[PDB]
Design a protein around this ligand. Structure first.
Ligand code: HEM
Ligand SMILES: O=C(c1cnc2c(-c3cnco3)cc(C(F)(F)F)cn12)N1CCOCC1
Length: 437
């Protein structure tokens, strides 16, 4: 009853229902999400006010399903799910060091090697007949990149290794989904969560043992994760961040890659342009250097446009502590505010012809979206891995475009599913040919 005065109702996802309601009912709408009444706020003035201020913090109630699933600690109080500002701030500042320009430059070798491995595997299947799940292949690639870059671990999923680990990730993601919106499922979800955390403990022990023997350990994300816990009473905080980075550091990247490949399969003219760009910039070099990345301007634009229509992470929540007028609507104190880049990206008020895929929206001369586009969020709680993700996906995409042509198998759909993140409904089944065929 405390919300009844707020405007709202009396391969398709809940975010689409939210979009319809925002269009119908305006910039402040009451909805039900993850068992709780929330208010979806979709004006750019509100996006700016709430995300660009340390006064507003995340609503912990909306992150519970990350923290713990079916009584098994998952991300716990790691970097995504920690909602107390001072606790968040301490760990952010320490982990930031691993995402410095110089840090990320050093990761180019890893990005290149895994992308090259993927392309060689795909080239061997490029007979224009064999169906290849690009979602699967891109997920394996993203996992292999993350594991190596962040932890110095070789998962070798591209070689078909670590099937248990692969299963654990999938069931855990299903657990998150079920938590927020029987006996065998509970059992499998719980065991998968404990497995992921045990992977953490095992790899942490290996790291500590390497350090003790004075073996060479290149500074990475894990270094800073360890550093953040220097004087902790237990390793539970460390394992929180292990699992946080293990999952967050590949899932969304994989989703973004899958969406991009899927969309480009029906954009032959754009693909031709991307191919030409890659041809001119990198030529027949096997390896992309860091300075090549900035030169792939048209690819940057396509990837931005991909994130506008297909953000893997649709948005974020802030807790409104005191009653506030938002765009002419009285919103009670202690209310989760829902921000959605998915919704605003598809609103004609913010983007002309919103369903049209147009990389030119992000062209040099074009007016930049002002608080209407935030696939990595905005403000202090924006994605720590934003530049990491942008680099790795550009490396992977450039290498695909250099070497291969992709056709979506007829019957494959362009719809989304909502399953902890947004991802293609279908496996993005494609046939492949070498370029110049
Ligand atoms: C295209 C790929 C990616 C997208 C679209 C994405 C999107 C986002 C979004 C929307 C948030 C804010 C979440 C919230 O408010 O609850 C976020 C935060 C975060 N992302 Fe990402 N992300 C991506 C890749 C990565 C990568 C590669 C890493 C790690 C290597 C990563 C780690 C994180 C972490 C740790 C946070 C929490 C940061 C903080 O609160 O201080 N993400 N990301
Ligand atoms: O669960 C989230 C969330 C926000 N960010 C992420 C990321 C992520 C960010 N960067 C890379 O990965 C991954 C996942 C995971 F593990 F489910 F796939 C969940 N999240 N929430 C915020 C939205 O509102 C509801 C609760």
């Amino acid at each position: 009853s405390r919300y009844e005065h707020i405007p709202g109702p009396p391969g398709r996802v809940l975010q689409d229902v939210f979009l319809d309601w925002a269009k119908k009912y305006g910039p402040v709408v009451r909805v039900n999400v993850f068992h709780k009444t929330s208010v979806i706020v979709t004006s750019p003035e509100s996006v700016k006010k709430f995300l660009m201020s340390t006064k507003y913090n995340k609503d912990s109630k909306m992150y519970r399903a990350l923290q713990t699933v079916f009584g098994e600690r998952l991300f716990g109080q790691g970097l995504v799910s920690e909602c107390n500002y001072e606790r968040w701030h301490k760990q952010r500042r320490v982990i930031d060091l691993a995402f410095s320009r110089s840090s990320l430059v050093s990761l180019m070798e890893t990005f290149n090697e895994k992308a090259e491995q993927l392309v060689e595997i795909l080239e061997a299947k490029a007979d224009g007949q064999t169906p290849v799940s690009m979602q699967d292949m891109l997920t394996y690639t993203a996992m292999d990149i993350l594991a190596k870059a962040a932890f110095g671990m070789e998962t070798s999923m591209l070689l078909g290794a670590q099937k248990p680990l692969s299963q654990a990730v999938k069931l855990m993601l299903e657990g998150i989904t079920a938590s927020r919106n029987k006996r065998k499922q509970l059992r499998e979800v719980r065991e998968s969560i404990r497995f992921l955390r045990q992977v953490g403990r095992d790899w942490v022990q290996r790291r500590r043992e390497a350090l003790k023997r004075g073996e060479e350990v290149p500074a990475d994300i894990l270094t800073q994760i360890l550093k953040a816990e220097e004087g902790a009473q237990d390793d539970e905080g460390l394992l929180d961040n292990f699992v946080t980075f293990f999952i967050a550091g590949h899932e969304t990247s994989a989703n973004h890659l899958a969406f991009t490949v899927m969309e480009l399969s029906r954009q032959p003219e754009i693909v031709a342009r991307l191919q030409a760009e890659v041809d001119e910039v990198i030529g027949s070099k096997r390896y992309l250097d860091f300075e090549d990345l900035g030169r792939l301007q048209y690819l940057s634009q396509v990837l931005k446009e991909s994130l506008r229509l297909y953000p893997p992470a649709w948005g974020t929540f802030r807790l409104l502590e005191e009653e506030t007028l938002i765009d002419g609507v009285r919103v009670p104190g202690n209310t989760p505010l829902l921000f959605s880049t998915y919704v605003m990206g598809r609103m004609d008020t913010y983007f002309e012809d919103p369903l049209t895929f147009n990389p030119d929206r992000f062209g040099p001369g074009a007016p930049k979206p002002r608080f209407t586009y935030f696939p990595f969020s905005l403000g202090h709680r924006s994605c720590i891995g934003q530049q990491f993700a942008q680099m790795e996906v550009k490396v992977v995409m450039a290498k695909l475009l250099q070497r291969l042509e992709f056709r979506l198998v007829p019957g494959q759909r362009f719809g989304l599913q909502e399953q902890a993140t947004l991802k293609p409904l279908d496996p993005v089944l494609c046939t492949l040919r070498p370029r110049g065929w």
